[PDB]
Design a protein around this ligand. Structure first.
Ligand SMILES: [Xe]
Ligand SMILES: [Xe]
Lengths: 116, 116
């Protein structure tokens, strides 16, 4: 399976990339909203891990949902009700906060792919 | 023309109703998100003035846009960039803050109907 990690912090992007590669996923990366959209169209990932804050995540997920039902897992340091709810309502299938557990992230990615 | 005013404060709802009636609009009212949706479907207004905070406005406008291009003018006490931008991106044609000028509200309603 192919995962697109949309994350503007190269340290976090590398941790997720390393862990998904170890699990046997193919990884493509993007570091802003424009790159996320280009990678999305060109690579057709099976799942996207999308941070909410990008050079926004809300906007990327909105435009994606115009054409695609690809599962989106939103990742963010923002952990209030309002953040989670508006990520889910704007199309996220799931919303995990940072810092996260590597094993939980993996379990939640598999649960998204299982249902999809 | 028919205006649906979705506002959960009966004092503000009455000020807008009074002013739109004086301008020759037919007015229907709704005081929460559920009533807004019911009035929308049953009354088919030409325009909707939608407050953002309801017993949300963001959710109402989202679901409306699933089926309809009816012009939406968002009205709110929240006046930050983030509020305006996410109201517009979630489908509002316009975003006016409270307190507002009665004459400006009227001018902006007419400008929405002119283009539509
Ligand atoms: Xe958005
Ligand atoms: Xe929403």
């Amino acid at each position: 399976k192919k995962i697109l990690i949309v994350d503007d912090e190269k340290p976090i992007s590398d941790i997720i990339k390393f862990n998904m590669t170890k699990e046997g996923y193919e990884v493509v990366t993007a570091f802003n909203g424009r790159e996320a959209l280009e990678q999305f169209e060109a690579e057709q990932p099976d799942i996207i891990i999308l941070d909410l804050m990008l050079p926004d995540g809300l906007e990327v997920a909105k435009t994606i949902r115009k054409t695609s039902s690809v599962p989106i897992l939103m990742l963010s340091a923002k952990d209030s009700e309002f953040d989670k709810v508006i990520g889910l309502e704007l199309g996220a299938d799931d919303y995990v906060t940072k810092p996260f557990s590597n094993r939980e992230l993996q379990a939640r990615v598999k649960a998204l792919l299982r249902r999809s």
